[PDB]
Write a protein that binds this ligand. Structure first.
Ligand SMILES: Nc1ccc(-c2ccc(CO)o2)cc1
Ligand SMILES: Nc1ccc(-c2ccc(CO)o2)cc1
Lengths: 169, 169
């Protein structure tokens, strides 16, 4: 009991763009939005998420740690102190710890991108929320309903357990 | 009529790693292998592909254009002249053309990756074929069978039509 449709950017035969479909998914949220994202600088999508939170939807956002300052820089340019919105929680996730041949320890990246709404619908794929995915790159997503959604819910909870409050905050 | 399994790196409750499952998929190929990838420098996966082509399997590889010289350099360091293997065709795909802030003309990237074997099984997800995905990053893939695989076959053909002979050749 899993159904999957495919969408592309630039768009193919389907009516809506990927960005338009993300806005739709967010406006349709009744209870909860769970987002995992590597880089988030798109202001239009950010505005939709803030608007959802003001109507009482709980919003949980997991961002790649090494790219977090891109998001912070965007929210401050918009005049938003996101750390004051009680209905939104933002946390960061690191990759694996590894030691370089010059001995300096480093961590890698969380390479994972999905949007999970009301524990019932997922958008999963290669589209990141930044201007280069509108204008420059070719990407694709899946829209997923049914039994597979439960696996994305489990994986969200697992990343949430691992995540940390961002050090700026 | 689509079945989907998830695998993670580092691995969870599955017996094989993502890299071991990619090797398995290529060894099991009887007729055709179709690969779309952004960066390919993993020697062990390259060796499995060459071995499949010597068995008579037809191999089509589509690489992101900007990153192509990293692949060619790996093949040359292995002492292989990949140009001379007739059962493998390697071609490049570019993203969209666009103008920058200063008016200059650039192209973006093909942000897509998947492995399609015998028109019947797909591995789709965020794992790229390089050392950093083994040691540094967190990633995930889907193993897909059934009706959705036909959609990946159509998309491979569409990307193949767009693709170019690499300028380095
Ligand atoms: N001629 C042409 C134009 C665009 C694409 C396209 C959009 C998204 C993706 C990634 O699968 O490919 C393929 C071929
Ligand atoms: N504690 C812990 C360890 C590893 C992961 C992991 C690997 C790949 C992905 C992407 O979904 O997540 C999550 C939590």
């Amino acid at each position: 009991g899993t159904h999957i449709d495919l969408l592309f950017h630039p768009p193919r035969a389907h009516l809506l763009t990927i960005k338009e479909t993300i806005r739709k998914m967010i406006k349709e949220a009744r209870k909860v939005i769970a987002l995992v994202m590597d880089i988030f600088t798109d202001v239009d999508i950010f505005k939709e998420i803030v608007e959802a939170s003001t109507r009482g939807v709980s919003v949980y956002i997991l961002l790649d740690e090494s790219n977090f300052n891109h998001f912070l820089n965007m929210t401050e340019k918009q005049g938003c102190s996101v750390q004051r919105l009680r209905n939104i929680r933002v946390r960061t996730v690191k990759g694996q710890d590894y030691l370089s041949k010059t001995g300096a320890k480093f961590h890698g990246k969380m390479e994972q991108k999905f949007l999970l709404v009301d524990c019932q619908k997922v958008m999963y794929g290669s589209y990141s929320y930044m201007w280069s995915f509108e204008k420059a790159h070719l990407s694709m997503v899946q829209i997923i309903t049914g039994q597979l959604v439960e696996s994305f819910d489990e994986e969200f909870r697992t990343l949430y357990a691992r995540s940390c409050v961002p050090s700026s905050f």
